[PDB]
């Protein structure tokens, strides 16, 4: 692909074929001239070095390197280890409708309610705002609603207030220690730039209030909108599965 600087960049496979394709051509050119048999057997070495090098670089001997004096990424290292396609792009991934902040404590809440800041929650629900704009008809078209989202009419804060009521949200903290790694709250909107929690569930995460990064998630489908209510509301688990005494202990 052409790059942002106007140069190019290739993956490592697209020159290793240029080792195999070139050393293929040097063989078919050779056999119709019939060189003696100390040159011809040396040719069949390098294909077996090269059809190695398509399959694996760092296996059979000293690896085949590019200009950076570093080993070339083979086809085997596409599948091998934590760098491969398994643990970095197949099991865990990235996901959309996401965000993060510093965490802080607000004890004016109830148990199931958690904070959610304003100018985070404007991007985090942008498909919800467009649909409810086209349903009331205050927005004539989709592009007009994107034109009106910078106008910031007061009804936009009302339609967002309409849509965030009883729509649950997930709270996360990496790394997940056990089953209480993620819960589900109902949001309550404040005007700041930080996520507020309830103070009793800090011991469940083993998160202390000194600069973590807790992440949010928004369930899209109708079933998961029930599944937050049905399994992972903070009230529906006070029993930590390790041992049948409550994790909601005064800390």
């Amino acid at each position: 692909v052409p790059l942002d600087g106007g140069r190019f960049a290739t993956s490592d496979l697209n020159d290793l074929y240029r080792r195999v394709i070139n050393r293929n051509n040097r063989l078919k050119r050779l056999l119709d001239l019939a060189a003696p048999d100390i040159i011809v057997r040396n040719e069949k070495r390098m294909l077996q070095e090269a059809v190695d090098a398509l399959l694996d670089n760092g296996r059979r001997g000293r690896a085949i390197t590019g200009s950076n004096k570093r080993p070339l990424k083979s086809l085997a290292d596409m599948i091998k280890g934590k760098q491969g396609r398994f643990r970095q792009n197949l099991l865990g991934k990235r996901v959309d409708y996401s965000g993060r902040s510093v965490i802080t404590v607000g004890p004016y809440l109830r148990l199931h309610q958690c904070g959610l800041p304003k100018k985070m929650a404007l991007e985090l629900f942008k498909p919800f705002i467009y649909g409810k704009l086209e349903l009331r008809g205050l927005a004539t078209t989709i592009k007009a609603a994107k034109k009106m989202v910078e106008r910031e009419e007061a009804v936009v804060w009302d339609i967002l207030d309409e849509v965030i009521r009883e729509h649950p949200v997930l709270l996360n903290r990496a790394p997940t220690l056990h089953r209480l790694g993620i819960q589900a709250f109902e949001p309550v909107l404040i005007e700041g730039k930080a996520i507020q929690l309830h103070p009793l569930v800090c011991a469940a995460y083993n998160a202390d209030f000194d600069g973590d990064q807790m992440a949010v998630h928004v369930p899209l489908t109708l079933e998961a909108q029930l599944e937050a209510r049905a399994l992972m509301m903070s009230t529906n688990n006070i029993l930590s599965p390790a041992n049948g005494e409550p994790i909601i202990v005064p800390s």
Partner: peptide, 11 residues
């Protein structure tokens, strides 16, 4: 006990 093909050619 060598395996690198640089030495195998010059031998």
């Amino acid at each position: 006990r060598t395996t690198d093909p640089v030495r195998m050619y010059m031998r």
